[PDB]
Ligand binder design. Structure first.
Ligand SMILES: Nc1ncnc2c1ncn2[C@@H]1O[C@H](COP(=O)(O)OP(=O)(O)NP(=O)(O)O)[C@@H](O)[C@H]1O
Ligand SMILES: Nc1ncnc2c1ncn2[C@@H]1O[C@H](COP(=O)(O)OP(=O)(O)NP(=O)(O)O)[C@@H](O)[C@H]1O
Ligand SMILES: [Mg+2]
Ligand SMILES: [Mg+2]
Lengths: 403, 323, 403, 323
């Protein structure tokens, strides 16, 4: 377990139970402890056509945190509209799609609002807020990280299109990001809002539109222009051929340009091109997943290391005496304690060695058959004893204290 | 016959307790003994520290106190597979050679123990005694006193061979039945004290003298080793030893041979069946010799003197303490 | 973190330090504490053509554990053979390939032997020993899990073929398995053995053979015949068409049958078929990888609590003091140590309380502003101090010791 | 005019050092001072123990020794936001009110310090002096000596108001410029010694007598308080005080009023501008009163006696030491 990830995982926990007492926010029927998640105080909503507010809140029934997406000022004209779509999207669970749970209407905010409830992914920044934060930078986003994004969105689109649905909302600002893990965080919002809007399109025509927005989202990041426009696409496209691969340029070209009237488009055919890259993404994910696996051991072991640290600290400063066997054991422990924590070189300078402190305690944790040298102050007493023996001596000493 | 120097030299030496040892002020070693495994030599101090040393060069191995230091000297070692048994005047202690405690017995009837031996039960049981009118039987496996027996005679030595040979503090030797501990025979070895006893299945050998020390008279060792025939149960002719016999051990491989040592460190190796052939050799102890033992193979000889030195002598050619 | 997941991580650490003291095994030049990993006392080598022994061992230099592959009775004809191949394979790092480091020859075992050294992957069972255990039965292997295997090997083959190498050894017993993660554990072995063999093949046709062995390994698991043979393949192939999907049936067929003389074969073209499955495999990994990330949060607290236990045990029992602040500081810590571990009831019996030990260290972990009562023995000195202060005194005390 | 008991009563009392305190043998309190925050009263011992007590009922809070006990008495308290500053004869110590050490200064020129005060720099700097010919300037923030000054006059008291008012051990008062530490004016207050000093921005007040104690002559306190006008820099008429003036404090709210105390625990509250109007009240000390202080609000009065007692007096109706 390194230094940076240890803080990264710590900040994730501080973020979850983080509260604002002066929030002046309500408590709804099913929720409480609301928390403003919006960084940008002034609000215009990229795709909703209304204003949007983001809240963290605890459920009442189970007490776990969820992300709330508040649509300020919507009129629930049809109850059919909501339940028609929350049922379908709730079924879709993907690693790159922020899972949507229910959707209800509440009036507590002081106005009529439509409320979507999502998974809470702490320390998520939007994809926008990450690669272009407000406050120069000419660094281009490295092609590999661009390919990871193609795959993760392709994975998300593959799921969405199979449920015979469409993303509808697919934008740089509506995609959260966490340690390079991007997820669609605005799904199912526009299904309700354009449920009975004029000029409704086919889900078959929406799915085709999902590819164009997709192509644009990447092309933006390539040319480092967070706001892109269909007016200059072709000019942008020429600018990526020297900074990036000819392969990538074709993928964007395919994704953005409309297909020949016979062909149609599907996620499958996108995946066919990027075969090599999907495998590399798969390889990275796995390796990261294994890296996590190691840490989940050493940090679970630390918990065990600590319970032993306790039992030791209890016996080694308590003196009260019966028979001589006790006097032998009680000495060995103090000498064991000195061997680890009180390591000193010649001239008595403190040999601090946190690797050393760990090594011994793991050996004690597993009852290692390795034997160490224990020495007294006057060098009178000398032991040659294995960790397995010492551990048993400790567990016994601590055990008798409780009787 | 003199010893060829190619057969007899000092192989290693150690001071125990040394000047930086907490028990140094109280005097020299109280006892020494070769272990019967792991190439160990054990040395006790006057306040109950035990030190063990490996091989002919006596590199330090382990050390630990086996009873409270006010109890005085470490009186005797015995060796079994599981560990080392330690006897003190007020208690009996058992620990692994590592120093790991096994059990501890401090019985009210243990007032001044001096000696211990095995019994009729192999290494599973020991008999302990001393300058007191009680004996205790200890189950070595369970670590508990299992029997108490009265005794009229007080003892300085115990060792099991064919029988339990028990040296009294008056210079006589009692031969005890190993099952019932009853006396089969009494032998008058020396006048007032026995300084050393060893035994094989066929022999007992002892060292001693006619009077214990007073301000009028030093304890003088007798100019012979007294010998008793365990096979035919009768006393034998003594083995003549003009330098005055201080210590004796039976040779573990030459079954009819005895090893005799005087206080100036002069040693004679003499066959009991024929005293005519004995090897004479000399050592160079700094002080007066106080204790002696031989290893199980017979190849290592150890001697501790009153200047706190312990020496190992033997052949320069790769000796081994045990198999 | 559930019950079994806590066990898997527990056994994994137990497996690492597992030792055999009764081992009739040696210590080599660079290694020690060897450990027999072999289940079957009876020995046949699936692909080597010699007898094989498997050992876990600690390095001497860095003390970490490695997996050793012992080839019994080998002669080392060419020094060119080893270094020509350990260098190249050492470069290949894949999530599905057990990384090979060096290869040396040792005779300590009592015979001349060749030793390959690998990564140690604790709790590994072979792919064979897992799906066909020596106890049995019935039951079908779920198709999805068959697809997981196709992808992981394809990923593994992709790396090797791109390095212009070949797998050479690709069999059910020469693939370890851990929580559904399969890896090629016999890599680089056959490169050395056939280095100057008589009938060496093209590296390009060896690569073609890799697809066919692959076809055998899956079809084996499909038809549930741990030993399969090209003698009945076409008949074997038909038996899976109702039990599994038509898609899968073609893939095996593709891998197995020799290609049309013009076509050749590549991993790339396999991936063209399995596009949809690749996305799904990645998706699973990610979700599982996210699952660990949650667990790695709850258990990270253990890492610091233990880290504090170290500093506490180190500063104490360590010596006169220069200035007077030290006598004040050195006192507060020693009195604090008594408040936690040496709590005593009325009449002074040891009040053991493992909850209390935790509570205080958590409060110390977050620097809680709660105040506790610290008192001296003679009741002369009396402190009222918060955990936050003590933590600062500890960090300084531990800090000053190393200077 | 006597004080109505509804405005003046004994609210609490504590023994410090008490009989079970390690410093009991060494004598009564060495100094007392009201903190300016957290409702604390501080008491020093003859061996450098500091004890703090909360509120009018003097409930125990914290306690700790601020220098080696061989350094002798705790001489003075000072109070700042970060913690309490303690002066002893051999050192100056600062700790949080929790007891957490902040810094420790034991400079070679600190041989017999008796007094310290703030200067022109708020709470960032203190001046320290005593019965020795050096003074030291200390940065309270950094905890280091930043300046050393030689001095011909030796000091028993220092306090900052408009200027640093410095009482010598001969009964004279030096008025020191707080910026340069130079003497602006000398005032002859008493004949041989000054037992107490207080000051506001406009006044100095002192207690004392004509001769220090010898076996020929007890130290006798003067029957008046000497008064000096700091505003117009000239001596004023003394305030008559027949019970003999031992201690004096400026009243923190009645700005021209002084609080004067004799050794029998009798207290007078008197306006400096017109002594004709004074309120008289009494306390009940077990022994002779040795020390006195008033809280920042003026509502709490504390007195320590030679029987190791410290008392708090004030109105029974909810008095506060600070905001
Ligand atoms: N599902 C979620 N769970 C947790 N945090 C989220 C989630 N979605 C977004 N966030 C965080 O909260 C912010 C998202 O709010 P959002 O309103 O989409 O951003 P915005 O910049 O205000 N867009 P807009 O309001 O349209 O201009 C980002 O900073 C994210 O890091
Ligand atoms: N690199 C490795 N790290 C950790 N464990 C391994 C590794 N390789 C194999 N194992 C395990 O150790 C055991 C011995 O390996 P292996 O030789 O493949 O087994 P086997 O059934 O004896 N093969 P064979 O001898 O060819 O029939 C196997 O059961 C594996 O589960
Ligand atoms: Mg917003
Ligand atoms: Mg095998």
């Amino acid at each position: 377990i390194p230094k940076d990830r240890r803080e990264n995982l710590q900040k994730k926990l501080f973020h979850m139970q983080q509260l604002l007492p002066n929030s002046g926010l309500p408590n709804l029927d099913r929720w409480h402890s609301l928390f403003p998640l919006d960084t940008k105080a002034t609000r215009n909503s990229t795709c909703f056509g209304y204003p949007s507010w983001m809240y963290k809140a605890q459920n009442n029934k189970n007490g776990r945190h969820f992300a709330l997406r508040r649509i300020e000022g919507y009129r629930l004209t049809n109850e059919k509209a909501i339940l028609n779509v929350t049922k379908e999207w709730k079924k879709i669970i993907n690693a790159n799609i922020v899972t949507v749970h229910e959707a209800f209407t509440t009036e507590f905010f002081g106005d009529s609002s439509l409320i979507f409830v999502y998974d809470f992914h702490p320390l998520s920044e939007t994809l926008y807020d990450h690669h272009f934060p407000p406050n120069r930078n000419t660094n281009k986003i490295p092609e590999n990280l661009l390919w990871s994004y193609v795959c993760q969105i392709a994975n998300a689109l593959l799921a969405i299109h199979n449920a015979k649905l469409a993303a509808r909302c697919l934008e740089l600002s509506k995609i959260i990001w966490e340690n390079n893990r991007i997820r669609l965080a605005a799904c199912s919002i526009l299904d309700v809002l354009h449920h009975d809007s004029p000029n409704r399109k086919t889900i078959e025509e929406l799915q085709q539109e999902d590819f164009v927005k997709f192509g644009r989202i990447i092309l933006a990041l390539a040319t480092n222009t967070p706001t892109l426009n269909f007016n200059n696409i072709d000019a942008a496209l020429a600018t990526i051929v020297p900074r990036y691969s000819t392969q990538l340029r074709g993928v964007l070209e395919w994704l953005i340009k409309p297909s020949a009237p016979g062909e149609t488009k599907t996620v499958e055919t996108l995946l066919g091109g990027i075969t090599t890259h999907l495998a590399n993404f798969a390889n990275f994910v796995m390796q990261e997943s294994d890296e996590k696996e190691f840490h989940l051991m050493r940090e679970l072991e630390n918990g065990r290391i600590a319970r032993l640290m306790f039992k030791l600290s209890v016996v080694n400063e308590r003196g009260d005496s019966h028979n001589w066997s006790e006097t032998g054991e009680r000495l060995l422990l103090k000498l064991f304690r000195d061997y680890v924590f009180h390591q000193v070189d010649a001239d008595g300078k403190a040999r601090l060695d946190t690797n050393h402190y760990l090594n011994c305690l793991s050996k004690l944790d597993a009852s290692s058959e390795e034997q160490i040298l224990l020495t007294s102050r006057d060098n009178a007493t000398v032991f040659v004893v294995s960790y397995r023996s010492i551990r048993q001596m400790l567990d016994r000493a601590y055990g008798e204290l409780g009787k | 016959h003199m010893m060829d120097s190619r057969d007899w030299t000092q192989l290693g030496c150690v001071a125990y307790p040394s000047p930086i040892h907490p028990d140094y002020h109280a005097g020299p070693a109280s006892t020494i003994a070769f272990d019967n495994q792991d190439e160990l030599l054990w040395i006790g101090t006057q306040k109950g520290f035990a030190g063990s040393f490996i091989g002919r060069e006596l590199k330090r191995f382990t050390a630990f106190r086996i009873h409270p230091e006010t109890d005085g000297p470490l009186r005797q070692f015995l060796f079994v597979d599981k560990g080392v048994i330690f006897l003190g005047s007020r208690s009996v202690y058992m620990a692994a050679r590592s120093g790991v405690p096994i059990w501890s017995i401090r019985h009210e009837s243990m007032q001044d123990l001096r000696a211990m031996s095995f019994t009729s039960k192999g290494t599973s049981e020991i008999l302990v005694a001393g300058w007191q009118n009680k004996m205790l039987v200890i189950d070595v496996n369970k670590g508990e006193v299992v029997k108490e027996l009265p005794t009229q005679d007080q003892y300085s030595f115990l060792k099991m061979s064919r029988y339990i040979c028990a040296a009294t503090n008056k210079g006589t030797v009692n031969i005890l039945d190993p099952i019932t501990f009853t006396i089969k025979k009494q032998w008058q070895a020396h006048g007032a004290f026995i300084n050393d006893l060893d035994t094989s299945n066929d022999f007992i050998v002892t060292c001693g003298g006619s009077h214990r020390q007073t301000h009028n008279t030093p304890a003088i060792l007798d100019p012979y080793v007294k010998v008793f025939d365990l096979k035919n149960m009768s006393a034998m002719n003594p083995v003549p030893f003009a330098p005055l016999a201080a210590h004796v051990r039976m040779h573990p491989r030459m079954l009819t041979t005895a090893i005799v040592v005087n206080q100036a460190g002069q040693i004679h190796v003499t066959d009991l069946l024929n005293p005519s052939n004995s090897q004479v050799c000399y050592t160079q102890p700094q002080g007066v010799v106080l204790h002696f033992d031989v290893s199980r193979t017979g190849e290592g000889k150890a001697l501790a003197d009153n200047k706190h030195n312990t020496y190992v002598w033997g052949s320069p050619n790769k000796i081994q303490f045990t198999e």
